[PDB]
Amino acid sequence: PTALERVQKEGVLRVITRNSPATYFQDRNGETGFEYELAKRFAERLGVELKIETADNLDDLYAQLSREGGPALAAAGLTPGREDDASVRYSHTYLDVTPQIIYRNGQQRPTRPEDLVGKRIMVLKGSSHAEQLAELKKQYPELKYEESDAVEVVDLLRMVDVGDIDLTLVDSNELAMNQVYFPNVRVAFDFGEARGLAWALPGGDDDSLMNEVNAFLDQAKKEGLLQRLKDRYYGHVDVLGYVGAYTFAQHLQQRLPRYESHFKQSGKQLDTDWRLLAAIGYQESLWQPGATSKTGVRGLMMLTNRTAQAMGVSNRLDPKQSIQGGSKYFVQIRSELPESIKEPDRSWFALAAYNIGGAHLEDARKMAEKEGLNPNKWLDVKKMLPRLAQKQWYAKTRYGYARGGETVHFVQNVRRYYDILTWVTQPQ
């Protein structure tokens, strides 16, 4: 009975991973993570259910994988070993990452490997990163670094952010994912060439499962799934920019605490996720209650007088009222969307209408239907929205010109800020 046959016979694919937003994360609304979604899709390919198991550290992860009755594979952003070990075999690679030395804005930036000597350094125990430093230590014997089995990457970066350690070493993708929480964290330099991440399978001569893993990852590439997952989880710096990333971190730390209870209160009484509402707040005003503009919108949630009057907001500059009014407006808009639009798209459609109004959004949907696209599918209607800004298209619509390009930007950003806030984890 082959490894694949055991999986098929048991009707379950058991996957071991790390506990973190990058790989696998549990939230009241559900389960997320780059590896989680990639493994989920693989389980569906095999016609079996996914069963996630977590490891406390990398040594434990590899120990579980090689134990009798262990999981089928490990999907945890793993870097294959410098040299082969009979205990583990790796799939083809599915994401190129660059190891980076991370330092604290305020202290001097080490520029080369030799500068790592005489520094307080911590890395994950059992990691490829620890091995890079072990290899380096042969060349510079005075190099010191600590290995912890009790920390995750988020903790290492937190330690650098607050000055508990001088430096750490992590993969570029997880740095990008975490830059939005740690305002003082900075890349010092790229330490070594880019490496491929791969899934790990148990040792031995059985290729039944391995060949399906490699066929799947090929299909995952061709369909764009790897790029789309990469962009959601590891695209914060790409999309927001580097200054935007650590600037958000600064605001998360300094601004959000003044308004968090207002968001939670509105979210609770409106029975809707408070972090989605806070994400709207950030896109609108960067959580600034005195924010204004010359386009007739004002306050933390940037309400028009029209909207403010309808929602019963008597002071747009008051943060509590602004948050409540805009939150109420968002929920009302979402409720009034045509019944044919189902979640999760319904919420993204609601953000579009929050920004551009339901009338203009209806024009975008009608255009989608004419092009033979699904008007109830957000990714289709998202293609049509920019056309409302073009006179070649808007002149024949019922409601005419609208800034649908800016609407697409608004929805993408809020969704990202919503992810970011959902993935916050508390200090140790």
Give the residues lining the site for Cl ion (CB under 5 A). Answer: 411-412
DSSP states of 79-92: PPPSS--TTEEE--
Query: By C-beta, is 88 or 389 nearer to Cl ion?
Result: 389
Please give the Cα distance from 34 to 44 (Å, whole number): 16
Please state the φ and ψ torsions of residue 151, each to the nearest 5 degrees.
-115, 155
Nearer to Cl ion (CB atom), residue 277 or residue 408: 408
DSSP 368: H
Report the nearest approach of Cl ion to the CB of residue 329 (Å).
20
Q: Which residue is nearest to Cl ion (CB)?
A: 412
Q: Which residues contact 29 (CB under 8 A, 6 or more apart)?
A: 273, 422
What are the tokens at 45?
Answer: 């390919």
- Nearest distance in Å: CB 276, Cl ion: 13
Identify which of residues 292 and 412 has a Cβ nearer to Cl ion in the complex. 412
State the chain's maximal CA–CA distance in angstroms. Answer: 74
Q: How far is the CB of 345 from Cl ion (least distance, A)?
A: 10
Contacts of 316 (CB under 8 A, 6+ apart): 298, 299, 303, 305, 308, 322, 325
Tokens of 33: 């993570």
Nearer to Cl ion, 418 or 423 (CB): 418
CB of 411 to Cl ion, least distance (A): 5
Residue 326 contacts residue 301 (beta carbons within 8 Å): yes
Select 54 or 412, whichever has its Cβ closest to Cl ion.
412
Q: Kindly state the DSSP code that residue 54 receives in the 8-state scheme.
A: E
Please pick, among 284, 336, 371, 406, the residue that the annotation labels catalytic: 284
The residues near 48 (Cβ < 8 Å, ≥ 6 apart) are 7, 8, 10, 11, 12, 13
CB of 377 to Cl ion, least distance (A): 12
- Closer Cβ to Cl ion, 199 or 348, answer by number: 348
What sections of 193-273 are H helices per DSSP?
A: 208-222, 225-234, 236-240, 242-254, 256-269
Other CB atoms within 10 Å distance of the CB of residue 252: 21
Residue 362 catalytic? no
Tokens 């010359």 appear where?
294
Pairing of strands 99-104, 168-171: antiparallel
Q: Please, what is the minimum distance in Å from the beta carbon of residue 34 to Cl ion?
A: 18
Cβ proximity to Cl ion: between 184 and 412 the closer is 412
| Shortest distance (Å) from residue 279 CB to Cl ion | 12
- Amino acid identity of 133? L
Report the C-alpha gap between 145 and 137 in whole angstroms: 9
- Which sequence positions are flagged as catalytic? 284
